[PDB]
Design a binder for this molecule. Structure first.
Ligand SMILES: Cc1cc2nc3c(=O)[nH]c(=O)nc-3n(C[C@H](O)[C@H](O)[C@H](O)COP(=O)(O)O)c2cc1C
Ligand SMILES: Cc1cn(C2CC2)c(=O)c2nn(C)c(Cc3ccc(C(F)(F)F)cc3)c12
Ligand SMILES: O=c1cc(C(O)O)[nH]c(=O)[nH]1
Length: 376
């Protein structure tokens, strides 16, 4: 399934990656998608690649990670590139400016990115208005039917007691989200990763699940009209975890996820422990991309064992090829998120990655994608 539209953007891609600033590249991409002039991938997806996380049914196992469309101003176009879902955010109750620019740097040779954004977003209220507009468009557009939209949530920079910010987001945007991702792993908000302590993380998770469950109580109508999302059901609850933890921490947090019955785990966020990128020596922030590939996959194996395979995994980190996706899936992941791939490969990310994984699934001997989960 070629397309003359995907190719023209590869021409622009080589230019931008070589001269234009990363965040400027991001703004242009988002701006083009805002006006619905990005290519489409309206082909039927392989039934062998369909996946699910409990009652969440994904048409294919590739979405866009958080931090890409932080404000939900580009949902329709990005999804129509060929992705099955998108994770908007991370959002905070009040929009922030973030750290000072430049805050995004690219090492083309190593296919790596380092960023110190600091949760720059428009705020929960405005992003909610955008998401409502999208759900209205989704009702009238076939290319958006059955596509998923998750919302990554966090805290404002100054707001102490992160629980309060989360409850506000839940109570304003919860009705329109298919799943909620708790971000306690961003390295650009000081001390957020200190909240991954078993006790703290327990109260955070339990408060989110309770707040989601409480929106349903005082409702006047049926559930079909309350949940204006894809599932027509209350959003699942996922947690996004950082890879820079020791084994003791890793096992107890996994124990907390079992006790609290979390719906999923997103492995993983960016890392701060990489020191082998010469261009990023004097740069602050977390690094993403290829140099994060092998590190995150291990973490998935370490966690897929710590939770006794009872909590599904969502893979994110250094996924650039179809074989990378299968490496993540056979390690224990059910779905994959692409971020740096879109940065370095552009519009062809979804169509390319989905084809490559399809060919590899049958060669390795599988009836469908599920058969591969944790087979390693
Ligand atoms: C510029 C930039 C901004 C990001 N913003 C967020 C964010 O707001 N929330 C979040 O959970 N992750 C954020 N991330 C992390 C990505 O979502 C993803 O977990 C990570 O980059 C690994 O993806 P990759 O290896 O395929 O590039 C951001 C990453 C980058 C590079
Ligand atoms: C999507 C994306 C994001 N970001 C930062 C947040 C991390 C980058 O730095 C990027 N660099 N490229 C090259 C992209 C992707 C891209 C492709 C095509 C164009 C266009 F053809 F329109 F010119 C523009 C941009 C980036
Ligand atoms: O989770 C996150 C958040 C940010 C940010 O918005 O600053 N950046 C990342 O690399 N990861």
């Amino acid at each position: 399934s070629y397309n003359p539209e995907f190719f023209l953007y590869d021409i622009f891609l080589k230019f931008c990656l070589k001269y234009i600033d990363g965040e400027i590249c991001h703004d242009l991409f988002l701006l083009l998608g805002k006006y619905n002039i990005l290519p489409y991938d309206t082909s039927n997806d392989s039934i062998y690649a369909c996946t699910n996380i409990k009652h969440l049914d994904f048409i294919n196992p590739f979405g866009v990670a958080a931090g890409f469309d932080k404000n939900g101003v580009c949902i329709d176009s990005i999804l129509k590139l060929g992705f099955s879902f998108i994770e908007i955010g991370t959002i905070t109750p009040r929009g922030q400016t973030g750290n000072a620019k430049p805050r995004i740097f690219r090492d083309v040779e190593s296919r790596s990115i380092i960023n110190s954004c600091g949760f720059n977003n428009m705020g929960c209220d405005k992003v909610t208005e955008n998401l409502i507009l999208f759900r209205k468009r989704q009702e009238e557009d076939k290319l958006l039917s059955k596509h998923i939209v998750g919302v990554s949530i966090g805290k404002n920079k100054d707001t102490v007691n992160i629980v309060d910010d989360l409850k506000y987001c839940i109570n304003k945007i919860g009705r329109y989200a298919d799943y909620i991702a708790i971000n306690v792993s961003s390295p650009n908000t000081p001390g957020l990763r200190d909240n991954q302590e078993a006790g703290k993380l327990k109260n955070i998770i339990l408060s989110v699940k309770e707040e989601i469950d409480n929106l349903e109580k005082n409702n006047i109508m049926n559930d079909e009209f309350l949940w204006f999302n894809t599932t027509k059901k209350k959003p699942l609850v996922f947690v996004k975890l950082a890879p820079d933890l020791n084994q003791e921490q890793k096992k107890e947090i996994a124990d907390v996820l079992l006790e609290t019955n979390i719906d999923g785990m997103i492995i993983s966020n960016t890392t701060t422990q990489i020191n082998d990128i010469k261009s990023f020596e004097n740069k602050k922030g977390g690094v993403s991309g290829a140099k994060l590939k092998d590190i995150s996959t291990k973490f998935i194996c370490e966690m897929y064992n710590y939770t006794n395979k009872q909590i599904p995994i969502i893979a994110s980190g250094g996924i650039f090829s179809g074989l990378d996706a299968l490496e993540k899936i056979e390690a224990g992941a059910s779905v994959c998120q692409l971020y740096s791939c879109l940065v370095f490969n552009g519009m062809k990310s979804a169509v390319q990655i989905k084809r490559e994984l399809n060919h590899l699934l049958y060669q390795r001997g599988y009836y469908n994608l599920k058969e591969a989960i944790g087979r390693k």
